[PDB]
Amino acid sequence: SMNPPPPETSNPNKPKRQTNQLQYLLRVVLKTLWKHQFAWPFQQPVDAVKLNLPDYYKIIKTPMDMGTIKKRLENNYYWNAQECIQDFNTMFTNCYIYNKPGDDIVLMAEALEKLFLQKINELPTE
Numbered sequence: 001s002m003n004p005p006p007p008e009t010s011n012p013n014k015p016k017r018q019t020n021q022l023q024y025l026l027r028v029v030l031k032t033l034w035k036h037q038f039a040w041p042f043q044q045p046v047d048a049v050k051l052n053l054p055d056y057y058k059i060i061k062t063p064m065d066m067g068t069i070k071k072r073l074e075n076n077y078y079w080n081a082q083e084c085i086q087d088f089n090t091m092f093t094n095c096y097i098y099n100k101p102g103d104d105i106v107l108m109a110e111a112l113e114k115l116f117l118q119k120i121n122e123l124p125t126e
């Protein structure tokens, strides 16, 4: 079995920006979710080989994880906050697509997503 290449975290062809909203996404949103007791499954791309999930990347064609998001923020990969918010939402949605309601991993995603929503509700104006 094989994992796909991880999502890119650098691309010199892609225009970059640092905005106050992106700074908030790193210092408040990512930091809060990253330290949570349920963060660990989301801190790296899913290793479908080690986890014996040979169907994971048959079902999930837009993988995303907080380790990737963290690196994208640190490397100023994004142009705007909406790009980064979309990556978070992709991560949560993938979890709900692949797994079953009530699975431990879904309960963990739901706890992180509640906090995500609480923080982005106070995203500062640009």
Ligand SMILES: Cc1c[nH]nc1CN1CCN(c2nc(-c3[nH]c(C)c4c3CCCC4=O)cs2)CC1
Residues within 6 Å of the ligand: 040, 041, 042, 043, 044, 046, 051, 094, 095, 098, 099, 105
């Ligand atoms: C040792 C350590 C401490 N902190 N971080 C680490 C390194 N990694 C350690 C392994 N790990 C892991 N993720 C998962 C994981 N994740 C998602 C989003 C999953 C799954 C399985 C089910 C379906 C699913 O949707 C399993 S094992 C991720 C992090």
